[PDB]
Amino acid sequence: ENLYFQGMRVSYNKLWKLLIDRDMKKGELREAVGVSKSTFAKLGKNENVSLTVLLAICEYLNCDFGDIIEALPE
Amino acid sequence: RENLYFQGMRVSYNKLWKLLIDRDMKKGELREAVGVSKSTFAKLGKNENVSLTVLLAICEYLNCDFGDIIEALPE
Numbered sequence: 001e002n003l004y005f006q007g008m009r010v011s012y013n014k015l016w017k018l019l020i021d022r023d024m025k026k027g028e029l030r031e032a033v034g035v036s037k038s039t040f041a042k043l044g045k046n047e048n049v050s051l052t053v054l055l056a057i058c059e060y061l062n063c064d065f066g067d068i069i070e071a072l073p074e
Numbered sequence: 075r076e077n078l079y080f081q082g083m084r085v086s087y088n089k090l091w092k093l094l095i096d097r098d099m100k101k102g103e104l105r106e107a108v109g110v111s112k113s114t115f116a117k118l119g120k121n122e123n124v125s126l127t128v129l130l131a132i133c134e135y136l137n138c139d140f141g142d143i144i145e146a147l148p149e
Contacts, residue, residue, distance in 0.1 A: 003127065004109040005134040010126050034079040051123040051144075056080035058146040066141020069126075071133040 008071045012043045015068040018061065033060050083146045087118045090143040093136060108135045 019029060030040045033056050042049050058064055094104060105115045108131050117124050133139060 001111050001114060001128065002109045003131040004107070005131040006127075008130045008134045010130065032079070034077050036076055039076060048126040050076075051085050051126070052078065052081075053076065055083040055085065055146050056078040059080040059083045064141065064146050065144050066139060069140050071130050071139050 007074050009046065009074050010048060011046050011070045011072050012068060013046075014066075014070055015043070015057070018063065018067060029057070029060070033057055082149055084121060084149045085123055086121050086145045086147050087143060088121075089141075089145055090118065090132070093138065093142060097136075104132070104135075108132055 016026070019026060026040075026044075029035075030037075035043075035053060035056070039049055039053055054065065054069065057068060061067070091101070094101060101115075101119075104110075105112075108128075110118075110128055110131070114124055114128055129140060129143065132143060136142070
């Protein structure tokens with residue numbers, strides 16, 4: 001668009017802590033939710049994915065957005 | 075290209091409106107300040123998905139985090 005704020009970035013580091021705190025492997029999450037290898041790699045690189053992917057992860061994990069994503073400074 | 079096994083939840087932006095209410099901000103002020111397009115802003119009012127880039131811009135302007143503006147709720 002023409003957004004006047006471009007100084008922050010997504011981080012999925014809370015998702016990985018959640019998995020480690022519940023003794024879940026990342027491959028287990030990918031296969032359970034049905035996320036593509038390509039989209040899953042975006043998570044590992046903190047690249048944007050669709051809210052539909054994030055909703056599916058929230059659904060499987062019984063959690064909410066703030067449990068898996070954080071806005072941090074670039 | 076995405077065949078997700080879970081499709082039962084939807085985004086809600088109702089926390090965003092609460093935040094504006096708590097800060098005495100109008101929805102129109104938010105849109106102009108952040109520079110969100112009219113069509114994209116309309117998607118917020120309908121709880122339709124928008125890019126994380128738009129939501130990061132809103133977080134930045136409001137000095138808040140994703141959980142302050144979106145919630146995952148049953149369809």
